[PDB]
Amino acid sequence: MYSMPGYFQNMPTIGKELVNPNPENEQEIKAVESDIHESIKKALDAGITSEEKLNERGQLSAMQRINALIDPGTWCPLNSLFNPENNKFGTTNIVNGLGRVDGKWVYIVASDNKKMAGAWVPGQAENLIRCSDAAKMMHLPLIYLLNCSGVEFPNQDKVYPNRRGGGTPFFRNSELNQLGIPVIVGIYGTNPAGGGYHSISPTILIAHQDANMAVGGAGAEQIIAAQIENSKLKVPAPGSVPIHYDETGFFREVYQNDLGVIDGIKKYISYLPAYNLEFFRVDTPKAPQLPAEDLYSIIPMNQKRPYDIYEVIARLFDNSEFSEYKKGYGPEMVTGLAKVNGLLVGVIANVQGLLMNYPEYKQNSVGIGGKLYRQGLIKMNEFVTLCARDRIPLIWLQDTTGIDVGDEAEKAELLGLGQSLIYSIENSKLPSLEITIRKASAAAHYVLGGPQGNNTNVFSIGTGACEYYVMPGETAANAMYSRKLVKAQPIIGKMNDMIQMYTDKSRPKYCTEKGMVDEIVDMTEVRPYIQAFTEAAYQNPQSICPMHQMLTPRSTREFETFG
Amino acid sequence: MYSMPGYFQNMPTIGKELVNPNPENEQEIKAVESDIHESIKKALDAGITSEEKLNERGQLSAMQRINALIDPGTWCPLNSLFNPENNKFGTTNIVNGLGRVDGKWVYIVASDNKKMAGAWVPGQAENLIRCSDAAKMMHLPLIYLLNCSGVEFPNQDKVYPNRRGGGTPFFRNSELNQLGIPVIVGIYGTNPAGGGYHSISPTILIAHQDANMAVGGAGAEQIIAAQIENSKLKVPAPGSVPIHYDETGFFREVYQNDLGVIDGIKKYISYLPAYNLEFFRVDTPKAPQLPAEDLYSIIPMNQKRPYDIYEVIARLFDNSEFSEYKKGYGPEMVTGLAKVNGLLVGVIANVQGLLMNYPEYKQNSVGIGGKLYRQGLIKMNEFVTLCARDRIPLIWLQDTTGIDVGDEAEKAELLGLGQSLIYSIENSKLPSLEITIRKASAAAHYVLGGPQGNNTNVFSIGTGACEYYVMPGETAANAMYSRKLVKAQPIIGKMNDMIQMYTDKSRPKYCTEKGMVDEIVDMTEVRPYIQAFTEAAYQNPQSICPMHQMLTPRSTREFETFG
Amino acid sequence: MYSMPGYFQNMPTIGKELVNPNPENEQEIKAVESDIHESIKKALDAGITSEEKLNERGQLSAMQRINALIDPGTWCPLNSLFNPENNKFGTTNIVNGLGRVDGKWVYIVASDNKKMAGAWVPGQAENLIRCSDAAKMMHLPLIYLLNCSGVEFPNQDKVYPNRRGGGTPFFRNSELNQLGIPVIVGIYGTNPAGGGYHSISPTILIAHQDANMAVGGAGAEQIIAAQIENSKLKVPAPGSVPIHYDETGFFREVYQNDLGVIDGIKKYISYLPAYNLEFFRVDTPKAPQLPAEDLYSIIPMNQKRPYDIYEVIARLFDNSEFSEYKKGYGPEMVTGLAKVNGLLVGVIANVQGLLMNYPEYKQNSVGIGGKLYRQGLIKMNEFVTLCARDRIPLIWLQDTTGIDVGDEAEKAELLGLGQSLIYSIENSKLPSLEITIRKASAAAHYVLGGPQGNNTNVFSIGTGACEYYVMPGETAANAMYSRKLVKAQPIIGKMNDMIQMYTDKSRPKYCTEKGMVDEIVDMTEVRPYIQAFTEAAYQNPQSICPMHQMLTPRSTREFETFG
Numbered sequence A, B, C: 001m002y003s004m005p006g007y008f009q010n011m012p013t014i015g016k017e018l019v020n021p022n023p024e025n026e027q028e029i030k031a032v033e034s035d036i037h038e039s040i041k042k043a044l045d046a047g048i049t050s051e052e053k054l055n056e057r058g059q060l061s062a063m064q065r066i067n068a069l070i071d072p073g074t075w076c077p078l079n080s081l082f083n084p085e086n087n088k089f090g091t092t093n094i095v096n097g098l099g100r101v102d103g104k105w106v107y108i109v110a111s112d113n114k115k116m117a118g119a120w121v122p123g124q125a126e127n128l129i130r131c132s133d134a135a136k137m138m139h140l141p142l143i144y145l146l147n148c149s150g151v152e153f154p155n156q157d158k159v160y161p162n163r164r165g166g167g168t169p170f171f172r173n174s175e176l177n178q179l180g181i182p183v184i185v186g187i188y189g190t191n192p193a194g195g196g197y198h199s200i201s202p203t204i205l206i207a208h209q210d211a212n213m214a215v216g217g218a219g220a221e222q223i224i225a226a227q228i229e230n231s232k233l234k235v236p237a238p239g240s241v242p243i244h245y246d247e248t249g250f251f252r253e254v255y256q257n258d259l260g261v262i263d264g265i266k267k268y269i270s271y272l273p274a275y276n277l278e279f280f281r282v283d284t285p286k287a288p289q290l291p292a293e294d295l296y297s298i299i300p301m302n303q304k305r306p307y308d309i310y311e312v313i314a315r316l317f318d319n320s321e322f323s324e325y326k327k328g329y330g331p332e333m334v335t336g337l338a339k340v341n342g343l344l345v346g347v348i349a350n351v352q353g354l355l356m357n358y359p360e361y362k363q364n365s366v367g368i369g370g371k372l373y374r375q376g377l378i379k380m381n382e383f384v385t386l387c388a389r390d391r392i393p394l395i396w397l398q399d400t401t402g403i404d405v406g407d408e409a410e411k412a413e414l415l416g417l418g419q420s421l422i423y424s425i426e427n428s429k430l431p432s433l434e435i436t437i438r439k440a441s442a443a444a445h446y447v448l449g450g451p452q453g454n455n456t457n458v459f460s461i462g463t464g465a466c467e468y469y470v471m472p473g474e475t476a477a478n479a480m481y482s483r484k485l486v487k488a489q490p491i492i493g494k495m496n497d498m499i500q501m502y503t504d505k506s507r508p509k510y511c512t513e514k515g516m517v518d519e520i521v522d523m524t525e526v527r528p529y530i531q532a533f534t535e536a537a538y539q540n541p542q543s544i545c546p547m548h549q550m551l552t553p554r555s556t557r558e559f560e561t562f563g
Ligand SMILES: C/C=C/C(=O)SCCNC(=O)CCNC(=O)[C@@H](O)C(C)(C)COP(=O)(O)OP(=O)(O)OC[C@H]1O[C@@H](n2cnc3c(N)ncnc32)[C@H](O)[C@@H]1OP(=O)(O)O
Pocket: A048, A049, A115, A116, A117, A119, A120, A148, A149, A150, A151, A152, A153, A154, A160, A166, A190, A192, A193, A194, A195, A217, A218, A219
């Protein structure tokens, strides 16, 4: 019961059973993964008010609220370790990511009520804009589990003012609404000022019976004397339920407890528009034919070692099927259609290894996998443009060391072709996922559907084998200091300092702490994130191309048969 | 469980029990209504192939297919008697309108397979554009029940070429898709060329086992000899199921019979995005407190007699509740918020009767209800702009004889203010319904949310008391011939000819035959159409304003309390 | 001083000196052209008030006003003979088209004040929407030279009401404004009601000293007695200069005479935004290397005779240069880049003649030039998509007899591929010109950038060799009557009636009278119209692709070199 099985079913299959497992490689990858998990655990556990203390006082934690809301096994956290301003507990005081609620994907933001009653901390505003941006690009409902004491007083200069500070999400919430994207909030505890605006800016307000939202909240001997007197007067926190339910009616519903509020949220989520994904499927959902566990052997932690990208693709997409666009033209890249739970995606991935008699504009040359040349750049421009027309979302798998350099490359137009790809991406007007397999380096990181495409890249993830840097430390040390060495030990020291710094500041955990990559994910979580992304992208897309009117499959076929 | 009951619940109630029923008026209205129903019946019955003959040959009729698809009681036909080119059977060979399918509103178009196998006839293309336009403005799924033999050969010049001819709907179907609006088709019988493109242009193709779609179909003694020989060869009609299911896979699903195809359509409709309307409700749905049957007495067929518009509003909207914007300012109009099945709409309606000491720019004057003056025009500009910001759809109830005329009116800016209203409407970017209660005349018909607003007016309906004309025949006769009478019986004859022609060409049936109004509806069907429109408008709106962020209720309240 | 001369300069040159001139063919084409010119002359001359009479009374005619406004030689009329409702003088009472004003292209509409003081006549509203649509798609200023007495009283039912009646242009004027497209009006004579709204709806109002605009204007023995008395009272026509200049200030400027008003218009046109076209040029403007006069021999009036489309392209585009996309693939079409006054356009044109060993999905077959097959349809889809990305406007040259038919064609996906082209066009979001060289027939007329693409086709023109019909009369007669002949002289008569009717109703003049084609243009005017269109399209485009970021030239080059 699908369109065009001749094009979309029984696609060529790729990959091979793993014959040479690598236990040492697996151990190295898992060591990175374990460190990430341990760091996340510590971060979520930290704070003056423990989960136990919260629970005794009648509150659930961020994770308890999230777990209560979502379908088991569907949590896809983002920015777990994001902490660009080096806050002591390792977080931006929110928990965010994608979760599924009775089959419907939603974007979730939860205040961390363990830490300073969910205060705005340095870096939080940037984190919040990443959330609303993802919801904007995917046309996906945004859900707040809010428990927010507003500006952290000692850090007001970093969280209160500026273009991308604490006030920006309120405008972003109005933008979402005006684009037809609902925002639902569960309101817990005390939400004054900054917290008040987080409460009132959404579409739907569900409140806990003891919660409040307000323009301003209740917040040496005379100060002590004033505080004890007012506390005996029993004056209620401003904007409590008797006000915002009974008087203003801004609270639409009130529940007795945290789980009640969650159930109210679930009800409003049930009201939201969403396709049954069957509408957009071209096949029944099928698991890959090869296990993801193999990725622990396939993807080398030895950054000098190549691997077969087809083996990775085979383990991430439905039934290990892949319909390659222009195989043999621009051999440094793979571009083609694949399926994720029966839904079409365009996949663009670097090829590793050495490419004999390549590229075509050089004589007696060998091509370097991971690099971009003329044909690969033109092929990608074409493929992005075709998928854009067909409304097929793009998934980019990065492992790159840059576009080819030198005047032969310049004459082959590579600078113009890389920027043409940027133009093609900006033109696509569709949500896209970027997954860094190993290397994100050079301007190639930008052109390969990088996160610098703020209108198209929803967010980015990376494996434990990933690393980010402008270029290798040794190359940078040469570029920085080669002229200085000639003109002139102090320089030599600076070079070794640089080489070490490039290593330190390119490690996966560091990269995600700074937000270069939103999340480091386990090898066995890559497909789950692809699934969440793709299902979210097709849940309520704002444009359609009927299958029988798609160009990508037709052009792909013609290249196969005509030449 | 609704926002702001203080604003949206227990609104002022309007209208009064009917104390003086008018049997003669009721009889006159019902005579128009009966004529409409009888004309529709005859039109649907007409054709060389009867419903019985179709059924015996294994086909359902247009109405049988529509009735099988929709929820009982939800059929809201449009353009039933539309026939601008005076086709002999009184129709454009399609049946169209709004229907509900398991709670989801959809726009429906069905080929009339009784008449020339559903051929394209003069006027059909215009009718089809009205269908896709309505779907476009409401973001509503478009459903084709297709059985279309393409261009009617003898009338090819009127149905084949031109900007708004038979090819235009194919572009319109691609536009719908690109706007994220699905088009689903059930494909019945033979659909060649023009019918083929109607088959392939939608998003989802569901075919009858014996149906076909093709670029070109199978279509003196040598001609007879050729036809008998080819018929014995049993060559299948091009593009049958063995081709478009088995080979091209363009038919997504195939069913054994007409009801099967309908059930397949129902399944794909079940997949489509739609809010549970509860999301947008401000109250539980409530019937009006006064019966619609009273409208047969309230609205006078005597076009010289005034009536109380509040009595009409009271019978069309939930619980006879109405929250008037700027009551007492621009008394010639009523502007305010009301509810339709718990959903907010803005209502704009003419006031009839004589208005003492009005308008304000004239001395010792009386205002004429049905006319537009300075304050009414400014009030409407403001109200349209407020509703636009609040994403509240507008329902216009027309009964008008024009904007005030003369240099006093000119100095009061009326020409500029009427056009300002046009600008305000064009700016609103929301779907709107227009309902002609009695008079649609002068440029006032345009400015009062008229159907000339092709980006906002979804369609228009009128009661049996309606009439359309530039101005009264007598006034026109004077304007046309007064100078000629002075400069000079032949002129007198021309004047009486004109007066009679204006009467003839302004009757409800004539108006709808020409498409001046899309449908003449029974008094007891006005609320049903309002309900269909409003529920359709809120089913998948592309923009939201949270209730607590709405300006119209706040501005309304301030005018009441501040002055 | 241009980007990428390697791609855009010294393109391959095409065409050959004409060796066999055809005087009889030239005479036949010119006979059609002369008839068109004579019909236009008669139409413009007709009316109760002659140009001389107007001039004596202090008014210029439509053509005098247009000629005063525009740069000599730049008048490109459209809809000259448009008269779908068969008005007696052969027109819709407006003169419209493109003209240049001190180097800036504008769209012009002038009221014909010779005929019923510029009254709204049947067909005029449709004509006016074609004007504002063209301005909308090109983002081009719209200029009204207005002298409009409003609704023609005897024909009110055809000009006053309805979705696309006299009120629609007022909404269209507000739409233009809201899209950032200025509308400038010169207001002449008396403009009441309908004329009043045409006066007030534009952005800039320039009035003649004796002109007026109003909601309502001044318009048996008692009628005579009333008219003589009021005429002696000297009551001024409502909305004259003392009101709309001195009181309301709606008239921005007032001039003493018609040429003054024109000069005021010229001043406001000078204020409008427009690129110096040099910005978008890739070469200095160059005439074709071969004379357009040859087209009178090249394009056969014998509709059975083929010709070389390259010879036509060579005579229409700069320096007879053409950069063909995918030459040798889909040989039934030519797709490629060309230059018009140094500006890039994409050209798509049918190839005529017989194509050996074609198409590829049939065995031992010959392809028919003028028809569309698999590769041509795929090539066009790709080219349209590439030009769309590159922001390069498309010019379609039609001479077509339809997409290939039969189950071999169906299996090759032709129905799906034709609709894919429709989707690709709708997706392009750029203005496009369509030029019918000879045959506009079948659904191919729609898919080849036909005027049925209401968001992209600005207008369409045709040569004296053009003809429009669903299919040939003989084929239609067979399709209509072959089954009836078998089942059964009266039928034979019907067939001959049809054959003759198809001939009569497909002649160039008839086609343009009905608006199937907006203008029949002389062979030597085709390039002038292309020049006006292209310069208008690049005057204030709403999107840009830098030359060095264009994909079409790169993809074209790769196909040439890679295979
Ligand atoms: C434009 C935007 C402007 C603004 O946002 S201005 C900020 C407005 N916010 C306030 O006034 C909050 C005042 N707080 C209360 O009423 C808050 O106790 C509260 C009512 C929530 C929470 O009160 P609780 O009694 O429930 O306290 P908790 O155990 O949940 O919180 C403990 C902790 O959080 C700290 N806390 C709470 N809010 C903040 C903030 N904001 N900054 C730094 N630290 C904070 C508080 O000082 C406490 O510190 P320690 O005693 O040292 O453990």
